[PDB]
Design a protein around this nucleic acid. Structure first.
Lengths: 97, 87, 206, 129, 226, 96, 60
RNA sequence: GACCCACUCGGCACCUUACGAGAAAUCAAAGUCUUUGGGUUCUGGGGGGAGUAUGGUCGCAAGGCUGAAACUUAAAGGAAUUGACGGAAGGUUGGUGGAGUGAUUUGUCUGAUAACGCCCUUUGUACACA
RNA sequence: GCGGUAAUUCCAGCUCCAAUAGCGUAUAUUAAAGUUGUUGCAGUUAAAAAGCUCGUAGUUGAACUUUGGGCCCGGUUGGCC
């Protein structure tokens, strides 16, 4: 059974893309198929924010965040990361939440 | 639909469609028959008499039965303007 | 055929235009229906009210042709529309259904809400799709109160009206009910404005 | 490349007939197509068509009345011989008592029943019923 | 004893059938009025006999062990020109058969039977080349001359004998061993006879008035206390 | 236009394709290659007469568990070693 | 497969079974008479219960 | 220069229907095919034996291209369905009626409503004495 | 697919069925086989669309180049004559 119309995630009218290495397992996988996630976590967590903000020099100052694009290998995407396996009807649904 | 010597055989003469002239058939339940009463001066409905229209199942499925009904009733003469022949 | 009595009077037009029935759909006109008049700015398409009145007179004329008034069934899922259908059933004949349509209605017996109507009328075909589809399996013509964006599957004499709510659908229902009382009833020509008001139908506060 | 124009015309007529129309536009017309539609029009499978003029091809706007079940081309126009027409009728027509396998003779483009009485035959063309 | 017959005319056709307003089935066929009750077409024309066809078991694996049921394909008919095909599945055999017969009675369809070529006393064959499909099985029915018989598979042949189609050729494609599909295909084919314009049917009639409107006040869904 | 050429003057490609594509079915292959005459124990004939070699005890397949009692036979004409079943109940003690 | 086998049992069952004889009876009338006889037993009266009939009934 | 509105041609694909098609899954084309003809190149005919042997031809080589038989077997597969299993994820039954060509499913459900009167769900499956 | 000790499939006997002075068994072949397919197959997933393009033969290839109108002569169909 052809279990998806798309087959791989987002590749039509091309035939080839440059592969990317998975961040967790170092598996090679196409850039379109990488099930990527924009991780946008802070340098200090909500637990560490208060006393660290109190004892810092200068008022407020900044307190920036770490930005990075996480890639994955499908296997790793299901095992560790949120994604799950879904029903035939929920395979059709596209929204992030 | 006859035999050699007069005598009309071929049981049940089918209903032609008003819109496309396709034969509406025995089994087909999607088909419709609209009945419109005969108004006149002095108002009021006048029961007994009907202008009838047989819409086919296909016409209704496809979803342009409305347009066809607008056309059919107009040439009979119960709609000033409404539906333009041109487009 | 087409008498001078059953014409669009200015007062009725002024009611219609007051009610904002002439304001059509925001998004798109469905290609099945040509009842368009001037693509006005701010994303609105105005409806030919002269047609709307006429189609209404057609629907009414069809309804009046049905021998028993009890067999006709009005349907609605919009609260405004529910009120309207109840008023239509209060004034004329024709038993209504408000709220949940309760599928399996027009199909085979055994259920309590078994009705075999000669004719059916609906507020919205998108919201009451199940009713429309139900009607197709036992020779039921539908007379929907469609908009520009709405479908027209299994529908006959579809009436182009604004079907948002507030004062809109109720006005159309008022016009229908009044029309079918004028036919097969004791009311006079255009002179009489009729005792019951359009304010009676409209919406259901709070 | 439009290999047979008559074939295309017939395709258009059939699709429009199936979709439930009363009218079609067909391009780019011919003598053959016009003769064909006259043959059809004589027995009354279609209404009054109209050839417009444009300096190149010619479009036909055909008005059909829904008596037409299906009419279709027989490519390649084989060579038919006296009594082969009967065999052709048995292959593609629904019954003996009606329908027309239209065919081109040296006499002219014509239905099969007229060819029997005129006692002629030639290259086959489409059919109608 | 303490018995009673009890017809119970639910729906708008029952009362008509009981009162005896409509005598024939022709009206029903014309206006496509859906026959819900099986007792409509029974007393409307008592000459409508019957027939079976085939019984096969159908199984169903489950938690506990294995459920089993019996499917019965029951074709019913009458030698004038009306037939019904009723497929049914139930755990009992008799229950499957009776219900199948009921279903067959519910969905009856007439056949437009005509001549081969010449016109003579009494139609014998089909009017046109008809074809019906169901899955792989496409059954085609080709008109045959007088006294030629029903040249077909034993099941299809029986279906046609029930109708009162004396002389007719047949073919088929696909995996015809399954009667589940084949008889359905045949039914579809004999049904499509009336859905085909011959030249004699172009003569446009006026559209008969629906009989439901004639007797709406007389016999219909009455209120009635007790 | 359904794969194959429906040209009026293209008989060649039709007949040639068919001749190429006949090589598939059993009867056409068995006939034209001359396989009955070349190969096989009999010379494409119904009954071939033969001598014997020895009596056998053939171990039958599953599920049909038995011993079949056949004979190894050398024929007259080619003189090929063949195996041959002996019909009916008993009846292996007739032949030697 | 293996050629060796226990051939000693060849014709085991044909031997040990009891060799009784045919019973003599009244003569079956042959040809057209037989056809007549068949027609008589079939298309007269006697059949099994239900719609179906058993042409060779077992005694029970 | 950019954007918005309406139209436009050329594709990239997409979303909804099913008019039709398909055994199905599904398809705006796999549609316009027993109502079986728009033109035209290429390939297949039960599965193993075998993409093997033999022959030629191509190449420095590895291999490619073309490509059998004898013999052997009553299957092989494809799709979907019910369970069963998972070292996968999360937290009872008919009547009538629809959905399907059926297997059947829906009802007997997310926490309202195509229904009306260890256990579970979804997915994977070459198992189905599991 | 039957046969592991109750065999509706074996061995016999009773009774029955088919064809009936004729039946069975082989091997070849025709039909069914629309399982060779021109009429009339299939090629997304079941066997199968050749990596893609060029290109010679071969196959196929727009429309358009006189219809209409009459005048008579005049045979063939069926009914009053």
């Amino acid at each position: 059974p052809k279990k998806r119309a798309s087959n791989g995630r987002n590749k039509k009218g091309r035939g080839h893309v440059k592969p990317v290495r998975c961040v967790n397992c170092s598996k090679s996988i196409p850039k379109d198929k990488a099930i990527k996630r924009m991780a946008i976590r802070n340098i200090v967590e909500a637990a560490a924010v208060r006393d660290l903000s109190e004892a810092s020099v200068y008022p407020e100052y900044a307190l920036p965040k770490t930005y990075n694009k996480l890639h994955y290998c499908v296997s790793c995407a299901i095992h560790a990361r949120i994604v799950r396996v879904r029903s035939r009807e929920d395979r059709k649904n596209r929204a992030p939440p | 639909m006859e035999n050699d010597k007069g005598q009309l055989v071929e049981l049940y003469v089918p209903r032609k469609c008003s819109a496309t002239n396709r034969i509406i058939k025995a089994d087909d339940h999607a088909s419709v028959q609209i009945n419109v009463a005969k108004v006149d001066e002095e108002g009021r409905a006048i029961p007994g008499e009907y202008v009838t229209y047989a819409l086919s199942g296909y016409v209704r499925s496809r979803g342009e039965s409305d347009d066809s009904l607008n056309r059919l009733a107009q040439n009979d003469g119960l709609l000033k303007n409404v539906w333009s022949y041109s487009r | 055929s087409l008498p001078a009595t059953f014409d669009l009077t200015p007062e009725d037009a002024q009611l219609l235009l007051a009610a904002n029935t002439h304001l059509g759909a925001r998004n798109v006109q469905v290609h099945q229906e040509p009842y368009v008049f001037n693509a006005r700015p701010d994303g609105v398409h105005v409806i030919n009210v002269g047609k709307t009145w006429e189609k209404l007179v057609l629907a009414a004329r069809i309804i009046a042709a049905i021998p028993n008034p009890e067999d006709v069934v009005a349907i609605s899922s919009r609260t405004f529309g529910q009120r309207a259908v109840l008023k239509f059933a209060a004034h004329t004949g024709a038993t209504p259904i408000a709220g949940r349509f309760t599928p399996g209605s027009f199909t085979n017996y055994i259920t309590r809400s078994f009705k075999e109507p000669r004719l059916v009328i609906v507020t919205d075909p998108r919201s009451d799709a199940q009713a429309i589809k139900e009607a197709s399996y036992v020779n039921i013509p539908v007379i929907a109160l469609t908009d520009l964006d709405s479908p027209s599957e299994f529908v006959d004499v579809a009436i182009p009206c604004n079907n948002r709510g507030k004062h809109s659908i109720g006005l159309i229902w008022y016009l229908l009910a009044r029309e079918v009382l004028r036919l097969r009833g004791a009311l006079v020509d255009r002179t009489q404005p009729w005792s019951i008001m359009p304010d009676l139908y409209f919406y259901r506060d709070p | 490349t439009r290999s047979s124009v008559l074939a295309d015309a017939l395709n258009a007529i059939n699709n429009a007939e199936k979709t439930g129309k009363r009218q079609v536009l067909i391009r780019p017309s011919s003598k053959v197509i016009i003769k064909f539609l006259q043959v059809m029009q004589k027995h009354g499978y279609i209404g009054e068509f109209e050839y417009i003029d444009d300096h190149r091809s010619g479009k036909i706007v055909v008005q059909l009345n829904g008596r037409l079940n299906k009419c279709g081309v027989i490519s390649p126009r084989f060579n038919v011989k006296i009594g082969d027409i009967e065999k052709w009728t048995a292959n593609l027509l629904p019954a003996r008592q009606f329908g027309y396998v239209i065919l081109t003779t040296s006499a002219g483009i014509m239905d099969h029943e007229e060819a029997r009485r005129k006692h002629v035959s030639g290259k086959i063309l489409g059919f109608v019923y | 004893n303490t018995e009673e017959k009890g017809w119970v005319p639910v729906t708008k056709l029952g009362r008509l059938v009981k009162a005896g307003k409509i005598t024939t089935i022709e009206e029903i066929f014309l206006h496509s009025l859906p026959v819900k009750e099986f007792q409509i077409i029974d007393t409307l024309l008592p000459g409508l006999q019957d027939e079976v066809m085939n019984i096969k078991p159908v199984q169903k694996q489950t938690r506990a062990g294995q459920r089993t049921r019996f499917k019965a394909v029951v074709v019913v008919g009458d030698s004038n020109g009306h037939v019904g095909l009723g497929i049914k599945t139930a755990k009992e055999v008799a229950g499957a058969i009776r219900a199948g017969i009921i279903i067959a009675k519910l969905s009856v369809i007439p056949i437009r039977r005509g001549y081969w070529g010449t016109n003579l006393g009494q139609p014998h064959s089909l009017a046109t080349k008809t074809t019906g499909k169901c899955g792989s099985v496409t059954v085609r029915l080709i008109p045959a001359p007088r006294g030629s018989g029903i040249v077909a598979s034993p099941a299809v042949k029986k279906l046609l004998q029930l109708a009162g189609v004396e002389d007719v050729y047949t073919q088929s494609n696909g995996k015809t061993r399954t009667l589940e599909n084949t008889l359905k295909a045949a039914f579809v084919a004999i049904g499509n006879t009336y859905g085909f314009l011959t030249p004699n049917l172009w003569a446009e009639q006026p559209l008969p008035v629906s009989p439901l409107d004639i007797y709406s006040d007389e016999a219909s869904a009455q209120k009635k206390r007790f | 236009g359904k794969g194959k050429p429906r040209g009026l003057n293209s008989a060649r490609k039709l007949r040639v394709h068919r001749r190429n594509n006949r090589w598939a079915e059993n009867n056409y292959k068995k006939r034209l290659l001359g396989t009955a005459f070349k190969s096989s124990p009999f010379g494409g004939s119904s009954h071939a007469k033969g001598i014997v070699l020895e009596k056998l005890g053939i171990e039958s397949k599953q599920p049909n568990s038995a011993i079949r009692k056949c004979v190894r036979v050398q024929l007259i004409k080619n003189g090929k070693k063949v195996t041959a079943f002996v019909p009916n109940d008993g009846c292996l003690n007739f032949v030697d | 497969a293996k050629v060796h086998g226990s051939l000693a049992r060849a014709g085991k069952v044909k031997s040990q079974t009891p060799k009784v004889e045919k019973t003599e009876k009244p003569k079956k009338p042959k040809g057209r008479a037989y056809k007549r006889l068949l027609y008589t037993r079939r298309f007269v009266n006697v059949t099994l219960v239900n719609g179906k009939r058993r042409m060779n009934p077992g005694p029970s």
